[PDB]
Write an enzyme that holds these catalytic residues in place. Sequence first.
Site, mmCIF file in Angstrom:
data_model
loop_
_atom_site.group_PDB
_atom_site.id
_atom_site.type_symbol
_atom_site.label_atom_id
_atom_site.label_comp_id
_atom_site.label_asym_id
_atom_site.label_seq_id
_atom_site.Cartn_x
_atom_site.Cartn_y
_atom_site.Cartn_z
ATOM 1 C CG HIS A 155 9.207 -9.596 -7.656
ATOM 2 N ND1 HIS A 155 9.332 -10.210 -6.530
ATOM 3 C CD2 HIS A 155 8.362 -8.947 -7.788
ATOM 4 C CE1 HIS A 155 9.289 -8.752 -5.942
ATOM 5 N NE2 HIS A 155 8.665 -8.088 -6.197
ATOM 6 N N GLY A 206 4.345 -0.788 -3.116
ATOM 7 C CA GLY A 206 4.803 0.323 -3.189
ATOM 8 C C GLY A 206 6.171 0.268 -1.869
#
Length: 180
Positions: free
Chosen positions: A40, A145
């Site tokens: 992705h 993150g």
Amino acid sequence: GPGFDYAVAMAKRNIVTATTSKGEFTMLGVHDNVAILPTHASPGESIVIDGKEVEILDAKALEDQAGTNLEITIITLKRNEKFRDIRPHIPTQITETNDGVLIVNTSKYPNMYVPVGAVTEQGYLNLGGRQTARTLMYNFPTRAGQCGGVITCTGKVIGMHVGGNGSHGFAAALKRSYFT
């Protein structure tokens, strides 16, 4: 040299920050000019590795024998730079551990290590509308993150973080055969 585990040595050369149109990711070099990223991340014709734009020569999305998505994309880079060959440290089978460490390396979290505890087989997961096989889970408040985070245990690299749901983190399991 010093390092509680093989992980520290590998990290310096093989764990880098990658920037695609979808943002910053941690990326893991596997050998030579071959690295992995969550499918992705969707890298295009090139990718920014540690501040430098680099051309992708090949980007192979992996799936199992039934055609189910593994969420791992192997990218071949156009660059003289060479990663250490970590393959001998990737298990030949999906691997669980009671003591895993997540390594993340982004501009928001540079070269960071975080023990996450037990990492066990989750199997099929619905990852953002897409069925993904061979996943692993760990109890850790996942957030932005951490995509691309590497999962290790003593002397082994065993997964790559690809998503999470508030309380759990999920990763694609790494297996040696994917890279030979």
